[PDB]
Design a protein around this ligand. Structure first.
Ligand SMILES: CCN1/C(=C/C(C)=O)Sc2ccc(OC)cc21
Ligand SMILES: CCN1/C(=C/C(C)=O)Sc2ccc(OC)cc21
Lengths: 113, 113
């Protein structure tokens, strides 16, 4: 493994702990969610993100954050605000962007000098 | 855990993997290596470094590199050049400092932007 892969695997684990029931663990498809494909054109989930880490397809924390943000946007677009799915997506998005702050990324970034 | 701890744990696993027999895994004792305490002023080993990581006592990769270099210098000071201990110490010292090179950490630096 490489250092960036280890950093992204750490972030991903923290985020998955905030989704204990695995709402975001696998790709949502039309077989479970009517009309999903035509509402959610850019699907994303934790499992695809793990595969992209393993495949070393992320070159930055910015790219990783964008996939995480996409996933939570999709969940808030498709599900109505009354659903546990929409409600959890809003909460992990807030927490996730607070754990990968500009600030926190600069503090961790002064540790490597 | 914290991001810096996870990064140092990664480096430590890479280094410990080059010492499958655990020459460096635990403190050398005078019962095993006569006069060690009298010759080696500042003992160091992988287990203590892991203890300091968990205890979040490293504030830089530089500080971490300093304990690693200490560990390998100690082994080459106490053990004669024909011994497995001296030879492995020299080999992991070079490998570890190529893995925590200035360049490699500055590239990793841009990845967290
Ligand atoms: C994977 C769970 N989950 C959703 C997740 C997100 C993030 O949108 S959307 C949803 C709709 C139906 C279903 O099967 C009853 C499950 C379901
Ligand atoms: C624990 C291995 N090892 C050394 C370790 C370091 C890092 O120096 S020094 C030493 C001397 C004798 C011995 O038993 C033959 C072992 C011994």
């Amino acid at each position: 493994s490489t250092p960036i892969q280890q950093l992204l695997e750490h972030f991903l684990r923290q985020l998955q702990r905030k989704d204990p029931h695995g709402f975001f663990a696998f790709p949502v498809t039309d077989a479970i969610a009517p009309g999903y494909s035509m509402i959610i054109k850019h699907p994303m989930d934790f499992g695809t993100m793990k595969d992209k880490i393993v495949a070393n397809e992320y070159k930055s924390v910015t790219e990783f954050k964008a996939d995480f943000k996409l996933m939570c946007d999709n969940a808030m677009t498709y599900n109505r605000p009354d659903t546990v799915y929409y409600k959890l997506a809003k909460k992990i998005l807030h927490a996730g962007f607070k754990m990968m702050s500009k600030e926190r990324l600069l503090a961790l970034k002064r540790s490597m000098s």
